[PDB]
Amino acid sequence: APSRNGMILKPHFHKDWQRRVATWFNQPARKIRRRKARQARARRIAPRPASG
Amino acid sequence: ACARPLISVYSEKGESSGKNVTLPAVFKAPIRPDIVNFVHTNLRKNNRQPYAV
Amino acid sequence: GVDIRHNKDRKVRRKEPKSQDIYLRLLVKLYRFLARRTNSTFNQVVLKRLFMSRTNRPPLSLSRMIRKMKLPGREGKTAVVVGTITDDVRVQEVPKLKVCALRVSSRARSRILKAGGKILTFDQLALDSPKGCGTVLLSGPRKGREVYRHFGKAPGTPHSHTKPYVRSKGRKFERARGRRASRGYKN
Amino acid sequence: PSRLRKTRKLRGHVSHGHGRIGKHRKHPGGRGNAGGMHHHRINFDKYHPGYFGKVGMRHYHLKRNQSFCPTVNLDKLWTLVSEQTRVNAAKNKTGAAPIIDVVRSGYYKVLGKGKLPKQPVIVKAKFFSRRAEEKIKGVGGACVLVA
Amino acid sequence: WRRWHRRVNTTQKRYAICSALAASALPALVMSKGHRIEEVPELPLVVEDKVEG
Amino acid sequence: WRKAASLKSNYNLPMHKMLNTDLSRILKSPEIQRALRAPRKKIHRRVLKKNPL
Amino acid sequence: SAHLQWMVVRNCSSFLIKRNKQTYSTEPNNLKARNSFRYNGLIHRKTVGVEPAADGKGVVVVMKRRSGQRKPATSYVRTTINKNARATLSSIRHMIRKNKYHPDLRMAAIRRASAILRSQKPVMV
RNA sequence: UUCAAGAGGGCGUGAAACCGUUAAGAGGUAAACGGGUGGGGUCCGCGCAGUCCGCCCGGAGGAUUCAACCCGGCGGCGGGUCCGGCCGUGUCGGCGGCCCGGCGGAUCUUUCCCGCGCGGGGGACCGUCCCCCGACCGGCGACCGGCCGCC
RNA sequence: CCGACCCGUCUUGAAACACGGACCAAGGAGUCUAACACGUGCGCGAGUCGGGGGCUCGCACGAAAGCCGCCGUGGCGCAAUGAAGGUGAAGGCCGGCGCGCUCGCCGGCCGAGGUGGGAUCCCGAGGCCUCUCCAGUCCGCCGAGGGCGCACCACCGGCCC
RNA sequence: GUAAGAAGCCCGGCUCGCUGGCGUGAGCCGGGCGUGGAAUGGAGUGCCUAGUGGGCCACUUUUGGUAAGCAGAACUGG
RNA sequence: CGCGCGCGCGCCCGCCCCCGGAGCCCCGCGGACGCUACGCCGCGACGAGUAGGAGGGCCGCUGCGGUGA
Ligand SMILES: [Mg+2]
Ligand SMILES: [Mg+2]
Ligand SMILES: [Mg+2]
Ligand SMILES: [Mg+2]
Ligand SMILES: [Mg+2]
Ligand SMILES: [Mg+2]
Ligand SMILES: [Mg+2]
Ligand SMILES: [Mg+2]
Ligand SMILES: [Mg+2]
Ligand SMILES: [Mg+2]
Ligand SMILES: [Mg+2]
Ligand SMILES: [Mg+2]
Ligand SMILES: [Mg+2]
Ligand SMILES: [Mg+2]
Ligand SMILES: [Mg+2]
Ligand SMILES: [Mg+2]
Ligand SMILES: [Mg+2]
Ligand SMILES: [Mg+2]
Ligand SMILES: [Mg+2]
Ligand SMILES: [Mg+2]
Ligand SMILES: [Mg+2]
């Protein structure tokens, strides 16, 4: 039921959007895992450039 | 620009030495608690850890 | 009893700024005194505009200022604003000015001082001219906002050049029944 | 902040702000944007005209990178370069006439909205407009095309 | 999936940092915050750089 | 105020809106006091109407 | 500046007390101990304060030195004086008036002093 | 026995409805209720007078230091004939650090080179941060040693 | 002594022969996200935002904080219009070459046009109180009258598709 | 329902592919002239916006009906 | 327009300190017992209320950050 002079909108929520939500709470640990992998590779390839 | 006086050093038993430093222009910046309160209360949330049932 | 009406016995003006910016409030302490203790109305106006909100204090552009002070008689006279001064890069020849305001942008600040100009605050104003003598009040375009295009009579009507609220601008979003003779009608 | 709301003020008040003759029942008009032709015809003829129908051709697989032409006017042209340039011109009287690439600063077509001060500038751009080409020659400059 | 966190514009956070330093001088404010301070010899208190060791 | 950071890539301090806050020192200057009316300290109250007749 | 210090310290301060529809302040050197601009020791370039002697005889007077601020250790001057309560008030009255040191605090000082000396006797036999 | 069983094996504290008893009071228009007074009890404070307190002046009694005025030291306020010196700003005068210090430039030299249309350091040039002396406003609430008066 | 029918709720209308209700303690009912419109408050300003990622802390705090040739790839904005192909926002005044033809060619000056209303500001005859005459410099205010005219409103006109 | 004055009256001059015996009309310019019947009081303008969308009575006028504490309307007040 | 108009003091002529305090209701030297300016003071008019809308709450309940030596 609309009213005085707003927008018309079409939101995409008529499915079951709620079993399938995704939290970005593991954002830092994801960063931390990478460094320790990114360091260690460059230690494995010792003098070779780290970038590649 | 405003005044920038001379601050004095105190050695590790008191004992004001002869070193002097003119203070920076930070200690003449304006003082606004509303901006501090806002920035505090809004950044003190980002350390939370969720809860739920 | 008394047959009168109380629907219009409170007035809906301001009495004080709604904010806690303390530098603002000291200015307000000052101009109340001058408005209370002087025979002028310049003081009154300024007091009224320090209470106003920010959409009631739009920014003034360096361009308009020059046009409004290059007019005859306004030579040697101070310019006075109760808001912000921006820059307009569509202007090359910046002459000597004596502006007073609350805020001033940075690029605008430099050019004004490099022509030999000068920048004042409301404190140093009231020491140079407590009563507003030798001044020019100015104001920005209070209906410059894009909000005022949606107002007025409604669309879907004749003789209403009014903008609607639409998600996206394209080919499928209006431009049909209501806007072509070939499909329904046309106001 | 729950403590600044108006559910903290309708305690005691029996109906929580929604009437007694008519009540906050579930979905009493429809559910969504239903009824543009039936029993909401008036909001959509009035405040949203052009909604129902169909118009225009169809372009099926449309790529918005082919159609790309960032625009600029003349007033906002001397700002692509610094201030050394515009001042060292009109000076030493050789016929300096500097060069201004727009495709460097992210612009392709040139438009003739404003005016510009008298120096004999040169311009390089992919496209031009008619009036823009005129104003430049009027001041004593030129126009140049590139790929 | 509540909204626990917040973003705040960088220029504001830098402003406030400048403000807190300013009022770190101005003895009156330190007193009011409850710091027994009435015997230090100078309030922007500074020492030799030996004490890092 | 004159230069900039050299460790932040663009940051000049905040600018003051109100230079002199010494309000009492202002209002007691001669310049303003010359430009004032007189005050009025006398105080008037609810007079009681007596009957002339 | 003073007002600037004040516009922060109206409502938020450790020396502040707000109960029973009353409002007091306990900062040192506050005559009349109320939350005010005129009566506050930490705000002004000139202030006076009055306390009792620690040994338990006489009055201690306190005045600020005006020259080196921002180094609170040596910003305050003290004297202790012990006489017959008519010399004691007259001495105070002479300090303030003849040096013009914040002269809108004259009688407030005197009342605080007399209160102390009245207490600083055998109030009980 | 335990500080405690007024903590006694489903035993921390231990509400209300509902009951038993004791003390007081009342009773034919079911009870309860609002406003206004009266009477009676339970407790608080009289005091077993409550005669409340404080300034100056007058009087009669006794008492021991100082102050009044001088001298010596100490501390502080104020001053301007701006006494002498600092320091700080605001542009200026000296381009004087601009290479005796760096940052940047859609300005040139590509007057050079480095590896060869170019990527970089050089050379000018422009701005922008800083050195030597002179000035004044705003010497302002930025500190001394002075001399003077006052406390 | 006078006054005085039981609360909630539906209702034109309830003390009702209209429903609910024996009594007590505890629980109990306008939320969270996503998007939009407007109003207010803060910051920067023709620009403004690092939210994704990376450099520094082992993470006691703290899964924070600071920083970036990322410094803007990009998004919102600065330019509209048309189904589309596609086009794409200022004038005049004076003098030279054709006939001011509601018209094309060489040189300078100004320049976002005007009408009406318009908070404030500006100039100002004669002065308001001057223990007396005249001379009469600083300062308010008057006040005749006269001008520069902000935003905003109504109209005229002009430019783009 | 209109009108009771400054958005008024008057003087003079300019432009017009409109109309044309000659002329009219409209628009622009520049000047001269202030109280315009009574009694009252501060006006104007713009955004966001809820609850409502079952009605009832009385004088007077009034339609159907034998009448109605009946059904349906106009005026004002409750 | 007769509660000042030239009043007073030395010797017309002159003085013409004057509130670091005159003298009683204006003192143009600075200040309220009031000045938490988000404060204090003074005048004058008004007060019905369902659905509903707004404001003030030193009214309250549980927890976090600082603070009450
Ligand atoms: Mg809406
Ligand atoms: Mg009412
Ligand atoms: Mg109202
Ligand atoms: Mg209600
Ligand atoms: Mg509601
Ligand atoms: Mg209900
Ligand atoms: Mg209904
Ligand atoms: Mg026990
Ligand atoms: Mg027990
Ligand atoms: Mg038990
Ligand atoms: Mg019992
Ligand atoms: Mg009803
Ligand atoms: Mg019924
Ligand atoms: Mg009922
Ligand atoms: Mg019945
Ligand atoms: Mg039912
Ligand atoms: Mg039942
Ligand atoms: Mg409960
Ligand atoms: Mg907003
Ligand atoms: Mg409605
Ligand atoms: Mg009411």
Paired sense of beta strands C135-137 and C78-80, if any: parallel
Closest nt to residue D24, judged CA to C1' = I30
Cβ contact G14 with chain K strand, < 7 A: yes
> What's the first-to-final CA gap in chain A, in angstroms?
60
Residue E28: DSSP 8-state = H
Specify the pairing of strand C118-120 against strand C98-100.
parallel
Sole residue written with tokens 């950071």: F5
Whole-number CA gyration radius for chain C: 23
Question: CB distance from C26 to chain F under 8 Å?
Answer: yes
Q: Which residue is nearest to nucleotide I53 (CA to C1')?
A: A31
- The interface residues of chain G toward chain E in range 11-30, judged by CB-CB distance below 8 A, are 12-15, 27
DSSP C148: G
Q: Determine the residue type at C178.
A: G
- What residues flank ion ligand 6 with Cβ within 5 A? D 15
Mention every residue, 6+ apart, whose C-beta is less than 8 A from residue C65.
C79, C85, C97, C99, C138
By C-alpha distance, which of E28, E43, E11 is closest to G7? E28
For the range B36-44, what are the long-range contacts, defined as Cβ-Cβ under 8 Å and sequence gap of 24 or more?
B36/E16, B36/E19, B36/E20, B38/E12, B39/E8, B39/E12, B39/E13, B39/E16, B42/E6, B42/E8, B43/E6, B43/E8, B43/E13
- Which residue, chain included where needed, has tokens 């990478």? A34
Residues C125, C107: Cα–Cα separation, whole Å: 23
CA distance C56 to C145: 11
> Which nucleotides in chain J lie less than 7 Å from some protein C-beta?
46-54
Tokens of F15: 């600018």
CB atoms within 10 A of CB G40: 23
Residues whose CB falls within 8 Å of the CB of residue E12, separated by 6 or more in sequence, listed in order? B35, B38, B39
* D90 Rama class: left (phi>0) / alpha (psi -120 to 50) / beta: left
Contact across the interface for A7 and C154, Cβ inside 8 Å? no
Residues near C40 by beta carbon (within 8 Å), at least 6 away in sequence: C34, C131, C132
Task: Choose among C31, C51, C26: nearest CA to C41.
Answer: C31
The rounded distance, in Å, linking the Cα atoms of G39 and G60 is 18
Query: Rounded to the nearest 5°, which phi and psi values hold at G34?
Result: -130, 160
With CA of A5 and C1' of each nucleotide, the nearest comes out as I37
Query: What are the tokens at G35?
Result: 């939350």
Would you call B34 and C20 a contact, using CB atoms and an 8 Å cutoff? yes
- D20 CA to J60 C1' distance (Å): 38
Question: Which chain C residue lies closest to A9 (C-alpha atoms)?
Answer: C167
Which H or E run includes B34?
A: helix B33-43
Which chain C residues are Cβ-neighbours of F12 within 8 angstroms?
Answer: 106
The CB-side HSE value for G79 (13 A sphere, CA atoms) comes to 9
A31 to chain D, closest Cα gap in Å: 33
F11 vs chain C: nearest CA distance in angstroms? Answer: 12
Cβ < 5 A residues, ion ligand 1: A 6
Mode of pairing for the β-strands spanning G59-64 and G48-52: antiparallel
Q: CB distance A5–C166 less than 8 Å?
A: no
CA-nearest residue of chain E to F13? E15
| C160 within 8 A of A5, measured Cβ to Cβ | no
Residue C130's CB is within 10 A of a number of other CB atoms, namely: 21
Contact D59, D66 (CB under 8 A): no
The rounded distance, in Å, linking the Cα atoms of C96 and C116 is 6
The structure was resolved to a resolution in Å of: 3.1
CB neighbour class for E14 (10 Å; exposed up to 12, middle 13-18, buried from 19): middle
> What is the token pair recorded at E41?
């010899």
Whose tokens are 């609220």? That residue is: C165
- Chain B CB contacts of G73 under 8 Å are none
Task: Put residue G112 in one of left, alpha, beta given phi > 0 → left and psi -120 to 50 → alpha.
Answer: alpha
Q: Which residue has the tokens 């201030």?
A: D83
Q: Please count the other Cβ atoms lying within 10 Å of the Cβ belonging to residue D44.
A: 21
| Cα A5 from Cα G94, distance rounded (Å) | 77
Least Cα separation, residue D46 to chain A (angstroms): 9
CA distances from G24 to D77, G32, G39, G47, G52 (A): 65, 9, 11, 18, 20
Distances in Å between the Cα of G3 and the Cα atoms of B53, C27, C63, G8, G40 are: 51, 12, 38, 9, 12
**How many whole angstroms from A1 Cα to the centroid of ligand 5?**
16
Residue type (1 letter), B34 = D
CA–CA distance, E52 with C133 (Å, rounded to integer)? 60
Q: What is the CA radius of gyration of chain A?
A: 24
Cα E27-E31-E36 angle, rounded to 5 deg: 110
Name the token pair of D60.
């099926």
